[PDB]
Design a protein around this ligand. Structure first.
Ligand SMILES: [Mg+2]
Lengths: 386, 155
RNA sequence: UUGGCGGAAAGGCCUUGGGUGCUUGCUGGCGAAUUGCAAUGUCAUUUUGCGUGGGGAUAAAUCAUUUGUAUACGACUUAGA
RNA sequence: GCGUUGGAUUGUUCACCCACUAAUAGGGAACGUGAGCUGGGUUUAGACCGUCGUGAGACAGGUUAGUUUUACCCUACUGAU
RNA sequence: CUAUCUAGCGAAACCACAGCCAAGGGAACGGGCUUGGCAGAAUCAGCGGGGAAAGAGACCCUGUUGAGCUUGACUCUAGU
RNA sequence: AGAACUGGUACGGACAAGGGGAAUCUGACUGUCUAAUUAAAACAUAGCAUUGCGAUGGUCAGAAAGUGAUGUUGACGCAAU
RNA sequence: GUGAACAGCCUCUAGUUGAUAGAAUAAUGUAGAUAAGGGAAGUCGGCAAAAUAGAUCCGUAACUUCGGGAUAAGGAUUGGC
RNA sequence: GCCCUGAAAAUGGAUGGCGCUCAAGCGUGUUACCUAUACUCUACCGUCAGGGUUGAUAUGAUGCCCUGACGAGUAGGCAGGCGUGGAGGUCAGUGACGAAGCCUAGACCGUAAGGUCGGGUCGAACGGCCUCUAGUGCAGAUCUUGGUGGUAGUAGCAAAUAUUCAAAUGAGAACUUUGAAGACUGAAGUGGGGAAAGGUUCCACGUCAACAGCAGUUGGACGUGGGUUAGUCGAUCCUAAGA
RNA sequence: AGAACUGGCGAUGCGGGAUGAACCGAACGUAGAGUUAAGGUGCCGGAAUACACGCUCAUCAGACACCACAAAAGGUGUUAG
RNA sequence: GUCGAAUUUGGGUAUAGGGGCGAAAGACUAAUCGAACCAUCUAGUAGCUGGUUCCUGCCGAAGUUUCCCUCAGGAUAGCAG
RNA sequence: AUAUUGGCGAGAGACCGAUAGCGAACAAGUACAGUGAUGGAAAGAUGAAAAGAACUUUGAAAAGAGAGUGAAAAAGUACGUGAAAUUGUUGAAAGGGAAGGGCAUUUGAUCAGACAUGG
């Protein structure tokens, strides 16, 4: 007979079922609208999240109390070493949706990728793409025909790329492989750009740039079987409740004589796919660079890796994307970094950023120094050394 | 003498019983079917690994609320167990069989378990003390086991 | 067998050249019964096993062990010649 | 489509006042919701009053103290093979 | 410490038959009926919506059914 | 009991161990009861008052009795409220 | 031994080491803990919990049956050498 | 007239559903067609009624035969039958060369209650017909007694701080014995004795089928034996409320 | 809630009204063949997407007795008068 | 809560069912108390509730009248065999 | 002459046939319960005869596999027959939220009645 007072329901019904994601590499369910009037380039990038740190920068926001003032912001540093092309895939518009028509692979497929097709790599004969490589022997034909098949039909073209996970601290040898939509001009130019990159390499600076807003697609940190209180933000029952209080009291009215799809129940928290949008890029680091974490303001040779390594991850020896704020996923987890589905003409989105300082103290405790230099300069000499 | 239905050559076949056995009828049942039809040595080698928690016994009938194991995959199943007391008895009977089959000059290597059936012995009854002055039964569900081993046909 | 065309599920379609069986377009020579006055008389294509003779190719997954980006148990993600 | 509140007094539903607020709308779902709680009121047996009765006792009159049991089944729902 | 998973051990409650809904009519709130929605083996941990879940109505009335108690009700009595 | 010195101002170092105050309703107080839902303000109590009785008696017991309680008592007592 | 102490805590003689066990560490529990800022806004109701607590010295209101009230309230001190 | 406004309710839903617009909607008319246990003709079952026929004339006179009509049924009445324990009579009945009983998606008869047969199992009795007789027929009674299921290999076997290494014995050792380590009760004791009570549980040897809600070689278990010594300890004597 | 006459249901299947004690049709031995009732004949579904003259367009049409309702009051919608 | 007394407790002894015992709750009187436990009278009575055991064939109802401490029941007349 | 659900000795039954008949067909007023008075069960059947399974072999044993006894172990001191619930195994079959039933037929399995006409 009508709830006594009114309050909004606990939780978002759009994010159901709260199950564990079908895979640990979160699917990319849309790419940007293809403008065929501009160069061929990747529309998303693979990468491994490494950790977070802090930035200092002047804000450029006219009319704000913090315009022309320093602000400190959290950033996450996702470890993105260059990816490698090994295939193209053509999709044909049907009245039942996009369909993969064919796929052509590269002559040579690396061990990192090859392993992705094996459960038990070590005790296998590694016969992965052996007979398929023979298709390249007949000077063209087999391969050439299918490239032509894509050019003729095929409404959209995707490339198969994969991570060089070896260039990365991770114990995992098996590499992550994914399709990526080619958004540069002409279906023909697409497959050609694709063919001219087989076995070769694409890096993030050819995909993303400073102050670019990018979305982030990842499976959310797992937490196992959750009670109703934390899974749904439900009010706790009073201390005097017999047999428990981390519940909900009324799982339903008498009629319908059924528990309904919409009330809160205990079960899996975490490990959910999430496409989080609109994270402004704050740095496109270079791997060779020894001043990753340096600034035109803070002019010392230091790498983006904090003292002690990124905790539970290790060092950043490759190019990296530094994005504002936080991002779905935990450290070590594969992340797709997709560029935007729309042209945010905002103001927040238009602000060009210059970092003033990048934090690099140990995240493994209350870090007090930025560099080995600084720690020595401050502490003087110790019983060890010299 | 007088086993259950047997459609086997009695002269290529030796057999073994075990009556009023204090093992779980349900559990013994489940492990007996688990080898029902095996080559005797395969059976013996597998019932050993079951004692090792290296393989398992698929629970198919008497089996609800039983936990799940990765070891059931082999038999296209999900709930399975490692019922020692039953593996053990079934082995003693398997071993007696092999014995009698030897005294029959039956070839060891042609032997397979052509028949094996376990059903219920009379209940053995114990009391349990329940709240509020009450008393309930606390019973054993003992077993009869009987198997036969047989010489495989050559074509 | 010569050229093409077909991706909406194209798995089909047009086309070149001869070869071969038939040809009721037309003119001949034979046969049919007794299956007894109807009942029972064209064999269709699925699968699956075996039998041959030719061409062809020469793997993995699971248990166990291992990781902790995962986990109530299964499951998930790693690694091992 | 989306919100519809924080409090003082009362077991209260209702009511009343303070206060904030975009707004503090009205109803249903076995007067939703007790193997979900709580047990303040009503609704056993203790006891104190007033009224009534000769008395035993009585009075939607006041007062105070008064045990809130079971899911392991099926289905539904949450998640998992 | 449990719950959980394993070895051993091993109960009870309850059970017409059973177990997906919506509407209809219906003993005026169906798991079964009618008309529709639909519907795919075998299962694990949880859960408290439903099974008007489980465990000869004490409320109320009826009986030419009681009992405890009271009294210038009927009929008596120990005693005095 | 006093004094000096000493420590990351700590020392009833664990253990052991009263929260306090202003009031209203109510029972004087300690004590008692519904073993297994009521410990209370209910029962008791000291205190106050009343009643009966001088033994051939008061109150009570027994079917009856050469029967019995108070009574190994006597009004500063026994009995009843 | 500590200490006011037959308290709590540790020990000697003596007696036990017996109450199915293994592997994990989800939810929800039962039992034991802690929480920034606010401080009863929670609730029928401060239910539950939290705060006080030994000892020495100082200090101590109304009221009162003069006995109490009273550890009233409120303070300072406490090791070691 | 039809159509529109007036026309607001709580799970998602109902001209029965789909769907239907010169209808598959509303008014009217005309044909054809679909279909009940009803109507018409016929076979058969039964019930009732009317009638013929034992004249010598083989087996049914309560019989054969002819004709007409009729058939719903709770509570309830009557009728004709089916089956059971035992009784008189009779088939000079069946039977160890297999009685009775039981089992049998084998067979035959009856509308049915039921009857008959085959096969298998079994092992000592039993049946048909005419009559007699009743402790004579079950699905129910929260029926009685006994037996068995699903639940279910499930709830559960979590209070009392805590166990570990090795050796011996043994078919078998987390659980027995010895050794070591780690701990506990902490004298208001998990220490040393007694009183009610029990009655051999005491001790030895052997021993594990049941019992000690895991286990067992261990035991307050099982089997076989052994053991309790008084002038001074008690009773006994005394009196107590009382009897 | 209570009477009147009759017919029903109760005690009764069957066809129709989707559904349904009581409405419509029709009451019942076992069957064959024909014909019908009430009700139907786009498809579900057996049977004319039959014939004929009109009416109706509803951003809330309508669609069949009992029966699963609708009113006072309105329209320069369209038809006939 | 109380914890040196209206204290707690052993054994013995007394009181026994319309009786005991009660600092009084209808409490306690061997898990039994607004009348214990045991056996018999006793198969207590029930206008009330529940069950009432084989087949087929025929016929086939009533809930109305009158009287009743009569209204959940009988007698009476009707319907029925 | 009359009474006799006690006692002693007998002769019988259209009685009951082990859930029946006395509570007891048996070491039954027993075992057991209750302070007590009292209450009070369950429980019969190997075979003619133990001839109750020598011996061999696998096992720690219990037993099992052979062998042997017996008319039969389809009688093994769990012992006549050995129903049903419920159960294991084998074999056939079916199974999109119950199963079961009715009329009809397809398919599969099974079972029938036939009987006599010159060589
Ligand atoms: Mg009242």
């Amino acid at each position: 007979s009508h709830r006594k007072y009114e309050a909004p329901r606990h939780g978002h019904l759009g994010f159901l079922p709260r199950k564990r994601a079908a895979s640990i590499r979160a699917r990319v369910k849309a790419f940007p609208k293809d403008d065929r009037s501009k160069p061929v380039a990747l529309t998303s990038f693979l990468g491994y999240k490494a950790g977070m740190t802090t930035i200092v920068r002047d804000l450029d926001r006219p009319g704000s109390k913090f315009h022309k003032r320093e602000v400190v912001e959290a950033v996450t540093v996702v470890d993105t070493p260059p990816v490698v092309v090994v295939g193209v895939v053509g999709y044909v518009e049907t009245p039942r949706g996009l369909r993969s028509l064919t796929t052509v692979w590269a002559e040579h497929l690396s061990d990192e990728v090859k392993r992705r097709f094996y459960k038990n790599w070590y005790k296998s004969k590694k016969k992965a793409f052996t007979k398929y490589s023979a298709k390249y022997a007949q000077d063209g034909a087999g391969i050439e025909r299918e490239l032509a098949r894509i050019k003729k039909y095929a409404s959209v073209v995707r490339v198969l790329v994969h991570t060089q996970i070896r260039k990365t601290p991770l114990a995992q040898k098996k590499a992550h492989l994914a399709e990526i939509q080619l958004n540069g001009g002409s279906i023909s130019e697409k497959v050609d750009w694709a063919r001219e990159h087989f076995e070769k390499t694409v890096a993030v600076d050819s995909v993303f740039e400073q102050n670019e807003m990018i979305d982030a697609i990842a499976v959310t940190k797992g937490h196992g079987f959750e009670g109703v209180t934390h899974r749904w933000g439900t009010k706790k029952l009073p201390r005097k409740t017999h047999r428990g209080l981390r519940k909900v009291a009324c799982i339903g009215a008498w009629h319908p004589a059924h528990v309904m799809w919409s009330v809160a129940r205990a079960g899996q928290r975490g490990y959910h796919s999430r496409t989080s949008i609109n994270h402004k890029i704050y740095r496109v680091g270079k791997g060779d660079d020894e001043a990753n974490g340096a600034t035109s303001f803070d002019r010392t040779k230091k790498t983006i890796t904090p003292m002690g390594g990124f905790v539970h991850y290790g060092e950043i020896k490759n190019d990296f994307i530094m994005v504002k704020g936080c991002i779905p996923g935990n450290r070590k987890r594969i992340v797709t970094l997709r560029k935007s589905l729309y042209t945010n003409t905002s103001r927040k989105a238009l602000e060009e950023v210059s970092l003033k300082w990048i934090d690099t103290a140990s995240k493994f405790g209350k870090g007090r120094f930025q560099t080995p230099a600084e720690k020595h300069a401050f502490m003087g000499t110790l019983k060890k050394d010299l | 003498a007088r086993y259950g239905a047997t459609s086997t050559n009695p002269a290529k076949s030796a057999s073994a019983r075990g009556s009023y056995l204090r093992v779980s009828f349900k559990n013994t049942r489940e492990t007996a079917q688990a080898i029902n039809g095996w080559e005797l040595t395969k059976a013996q080698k597998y019932l050993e690994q079951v004692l090792d928690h290296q393989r398992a016994i698929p629970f198919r009938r008497f089996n609800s609320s039983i936990g799940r194991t990765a070891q059931g995959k082999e038999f296209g199943v999900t709930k399975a167990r490692w019922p020692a007391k039953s593996v053990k008895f079934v082995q003693g009977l398997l071993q007696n069989a092999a014995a009698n089959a030897e005294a029959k000059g039956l070839d060891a290597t042609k032997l397979y378990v052509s028949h094996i059936q376990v059903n219920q012995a009379p209940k053995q009854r114990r009391r349990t003390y329940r709240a509020h002055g009450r008393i309930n039964k606390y019973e054993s569900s003992p077993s009869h086991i009987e198997l036969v081993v047989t010489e495989k046909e050559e074509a």
